[PDB]
């Protein structure tokens, strides 16, 4: 009937990740309670949608995956990408070595006229960190599961070759996906053959 596949895994920070959001110069988005760095699910969803739109090219498949509010063709979002929270194993590893979860990066901007360097501070998530990511795929149609999952594989490949937040053309936000499990939590659909990345 209706099925939901749970894709849990880890996002490993290859290079310092800055997703904007006391007084800190360009702070990163954090969990309000634990004050831990997070990767908002909206960020991942938007980045994968943009990468898949670049790849395919809105297109119908993007509407099936990330949902559409267009008049007439109201499409439900098949992908629910939850916020990626700072991993507990990464938390223990960073508590060891006396390493902070976030680093401060200092950058210059050399003017094209006066050759004067304006400094700028940003905050990033340290390269050793990992985030527990959780995604739910809704099987609204059984015939498009393979197409949806190959589109997700293409988006994940593009994301692994892209950044996730901040200015990644200047060496920020590189990430890697490790898929711990892909198991059908709702319904009878067989997701054993399915794979991402």
């Amino acid at each position: 009937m209706y099925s939901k596949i749970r894709i849990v895994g880890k996002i490993d920070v290859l290079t310092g990740l800055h997703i904007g959001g006391g007084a800190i110069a360009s702070p990163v988005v954090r969990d309000p309670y634990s004050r831990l760095p997070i990767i908002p699910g909206s960020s991942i969803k938007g980045k994968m949608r943009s990468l898949l739109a670049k790849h395919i090219g809105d297109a119908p498949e993007i509407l099936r995956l990330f949902g559409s509010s267009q008049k007439g063709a109201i499409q439900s979002s098949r992908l629910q990408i939850s916020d990626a929270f700072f991993s507990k194993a990464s938390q223990e590893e960073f508590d060891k070595k006396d390493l902070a979860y976030t680093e401060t990066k200092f950058e210059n901007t050399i003017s094209r006229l006066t050759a004067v360097a304006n400094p700028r501070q940003i905050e990033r998530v340290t390269r050793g960190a990992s985030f527990d990511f959780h995604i739910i795929y809704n099987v609204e149609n059984i015939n498009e599961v393979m197409a949806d999952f190959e589109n997700i594989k293409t988006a994940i490949h593009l994301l692994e070759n892209d950044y996730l937040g901040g200015g990644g053309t200047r060496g920020n936000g590189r990430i890697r996906f490790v898929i711990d499990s892909i198991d059908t939590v709702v319904g009878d659909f067989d997701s054993s053959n399915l794979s991402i990345k």
């Binding site: 009937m1 209706y2 939901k4 749970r6 959001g21 988005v29 969990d31 309000p32 309670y33 908002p40 699910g41 909206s42 991942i44 969803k45 938007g46 943009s50 990330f66 949902g67 509010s69 008049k71 007439g72 109201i74 499409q75 439900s76 979002s77 992908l79 629910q80 990408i81 939850s82 916020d83 929270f85 959780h134 739910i136 939590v185 709702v186």
Partner: protein, 304 residues
């Protein structure tokens, strides 16, 4: 009719909206939960008869490490001889622990005790995450920021509610809640909010109170009676009318997204001397399907 306690522990922050995308409410009424349950039943192609005929549920109430919180009764409370501002404490009180519920009905809760109860709630932190929309940038435009008001619960806090019905209704609700863990409740479920895990069990601590008899009845859910019951159930009542609004979340209701008809329901905690049995009203305006608004009454009897 067997009462089942459903406890919901939330993984990600939740966006419970009142009127805006920036609103960060910590709870939802029985209307939102029942609409989510109906959507889940339609997704799983189950029958809607048990939900629409024999399920009585309460609002989503807070719970923390120490106690479960019930809505504050709208009872006439007496203060000290000259403590006029102390009444404001009872005005700011929203939830009372079950153990301290009866004491509140008997009038043995002072203003300082009410303030202690109000500050003793440890549900969580409400925040406002600022996001952006870069879709117009690719069309020679500008980014459009917006705000989502979320609420993150403390590690041992969450939202509980009580369900009443026969065995078949209870089991169907178990399947519906199991699917709702992964569907999510609230606002941006597809954008990383509302994910939770729920446990359904028996509630002796609540069966002690639900077996209590008294002279007054307290609403545990946002309810309203039909005209015939409203004729005689409104005498000596102390209630609070809430305007239930919103858009219809459905892919087949119409072409574009439209709002549903305005509804008005009594709040949780409203005290009546006559127990009225609500119903499931229709807030649909000539749509493809009938949009349901659950306003049945889950009652808690007490002595004033």
């Amino acid at each position: 009719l067997v009462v089942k306690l459903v406890k919901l522990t939330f993984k990600s922050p939740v966006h419970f909206g009142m009127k805006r995308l920036s609103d960060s409410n910590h709870t939802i009424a029985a209307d939102t939960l029942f609409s989510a349950l109906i959507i889940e039943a339609l997704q799983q192609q189950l029958e809607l008869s048990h939900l629409l005929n024999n399920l009585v549920i309460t609002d989503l109430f807070p719970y923390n490490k120490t106690s479960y919180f019930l809505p504050k009764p709208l009872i006439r409370i007496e203060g000290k001889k000259g403590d006029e501002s102390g009444y404001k404490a009872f005005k700011k009180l929203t939830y009372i622990p079950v153990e301290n519920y009866s004491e509140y009905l008997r009038g043995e809760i002072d203003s300082l005790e009410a303030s202690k109860i109000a500050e003793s709630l440890n549900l969580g932190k409400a925040s406002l995450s600022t996001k952006v929309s870069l879709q117009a940038v690719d069309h020679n435009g500008e980014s459009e920021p917006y705000s989502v008001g979320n609420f993150t619960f403390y590690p041992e806090s969450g939202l509980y509610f009580l369900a009443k019905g026969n065995a078949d209704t209870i089991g169907q609700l178990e399947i519906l809640m199991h699917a709702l863990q992964y569907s999510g409740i609230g606002g941006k479920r597809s954008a990383g909010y509302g994910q939770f895990r729920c446990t359904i069990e028996d509630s002796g601590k609540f069966d002690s109170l639900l077996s209590q008899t008294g002279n007054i009845a307290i609403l545990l859910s946002s309810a309203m009676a039909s005209d015939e019951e409203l004729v005689d159930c409104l005498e000596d009542a102390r209630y609070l009318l809430k305007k239930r609004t919103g858009f219809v979340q459905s892919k087949t209701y119409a072409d574009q997204l439209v709002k549903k008809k305005d509804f008005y329901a009594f709040s949780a905690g409203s005290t009546f001397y006559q127990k009225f049995n609500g119903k499931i009203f229709d807030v649909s305006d000539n749509g493809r399907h009938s949009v349901y608004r659950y306003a049945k009454a889950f009652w808690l009897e007490g002595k004033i």
